[PDB]
Design a protein around this ligand. Structure first.
Ligand SMILES: Cc1cc(C(=O)Nc2ccc(O)c(-c3cc(C(=O)O)ccn3)c2)no1
Ligand SMILES: [Mn+2]
Ligand SMILES: [Zn+2]
Length: 350
């Protein structure tokens, strides 16, 4: 049944009506009923009717406390990205650097050309990413798909423990410029994420189906044996860039999509993704959960080499949503096997 929906596991694109767009968790359940999760990544174009903010003219004063310069080293489609923290600057100052002759987008025709220049010049002229800025650009009254308050069961973490985790159950803003990158990764605790491109040049994405995630990890461990030996989940460092030609050379299934201003991207549990920005832009994102995520959370393989890494206690989720398995799980005897093709239980009504 689920196997027969999106059998190619390609990235799907949805055009919800305003009525479908009102209930967040419901529409996520719907696109899962259509097999969208199999790609690991889906695009959602909101109704033309909709807008999270009337104007972005008031934000050039917004502070980016920790701009990051992205040093990239490597060759032959394999790279490691090193972050050099720069001193705080305003959106105004960032935009100026971004559009400057030194850092601005190169001219090009088709997307494949711009993509080629990305992989050829990755290691040159390291750009600056205005990443991980705590905040939201949603107007306080927007009640549809509000990244600040999506109301999924991820809310159980703060509700139960008072714990907030920046960018995970709070919103992050990302100011891009040409050739700024996000490395191959799944989300913390293998959660969902939502990404909204407020304004500016596009953001291009690569994705690998969850059902082939393990194959990507095996490749990554082979190419980086030192890193694999020091950490049980070194891709969570988010420093590892791998070109689509390299994935193609080693038989890893993957898809590409380009995100335009005003569009949503949804990543799904255990969905590996990576990509880059085309030029000056701004994105807002956070994580979220569904009932399906819980098993993923229970089995997520975490970074073993850093204290300050993100770790959510699964206990409250197993008690409340899997009470019959709690004893078994707590005694380490819960051998549930994840089927990456099945849609979340909330999808029943479709
Ligand atoms: C140092 C340091 C920290 C990070 C990081 O946490 N990055 C991160 C953490 C979680 C994510 O989901 C994404 C991410 C970022 C984007 C994007 O930048 O557009 C798109 C998709 N995923 C990126 N990268 O370098
Ligand atoms: Mn991500
Ligand atoms: Zn680690």
């Amino acid at each position: 049944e689920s196997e027969t929906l999106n059998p190619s596991a390609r990235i799907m694109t949805f055009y919800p009506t305003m009525e479908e767009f009102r209930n967040f968790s419901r529409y996520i359940a719907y696109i899962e009923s259509q097999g969208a999760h199999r790609a690991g990544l889906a695009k959602v174009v909101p109704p033309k009717e909709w807008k999270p903010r009337a104007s972005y003219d008031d934000i050039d004063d917004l502070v980016i406390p920790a701009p990051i310069q992205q040093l990239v080293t490597g060759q032959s489609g394999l790279f490691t990205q090193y972050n050099i923290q720069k001193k705080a600057m305003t959106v105004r100052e960032f935009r100026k650097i971004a559009n400057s002759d030194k850092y601005c987008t190169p001219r090009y025709s088709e997307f494949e050309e711009l993509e080629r220049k990305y992989w050829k010049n990755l290691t040159f002229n390291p750009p600056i990413y205005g990443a991980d800025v705590n905040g939201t650009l949603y107007e306080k009254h927007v009640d549809e798909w509000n990244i600040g308050r999506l109301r999924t069961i991820l809310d159980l973490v703060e509700k139960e423990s008072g714990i907030t985790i920046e960018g995970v159950n709070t919103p992050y803003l990302y100011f891009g410029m040409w050739k700024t990158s996000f490395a191959w990764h799944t989300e913390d605790m293998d959660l969902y994420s939502i990404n909204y491109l407020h304004f500016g040049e596009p953001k291009s994405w690569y994705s690998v189906p969850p059902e082939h995630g393990k194959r990507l990890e095996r490749l990554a461990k082979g190419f980086f044996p030192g890193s694999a030996q020091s950490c049980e989940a070194f891709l969570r460092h988010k420093m590892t860039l791998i070109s689509p030609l390299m994935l193609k050379k080693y038989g890893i299934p993957f898809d590409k999509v380009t995100q335009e201003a005003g569009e949503f991207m949804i990543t799904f549990p255990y969905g590996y993704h990576a990509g880059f920005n085309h030029g000056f832009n701004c994105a807002e994102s956070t994580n979220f959960a569904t009932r399906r995520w819980i098993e993923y959370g229970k089995q997520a393989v975490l970074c073993s080499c850093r204290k300050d890494m993100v770790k959510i206690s699964m206990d409250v989720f197993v008690r409340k949503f899997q009470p019959e398995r709690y004893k078994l799980w707590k005694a380490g005897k819960d051998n549930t096997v994840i089927d990456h093709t099945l849609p979340t239980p909330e999808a029943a009504e479709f």
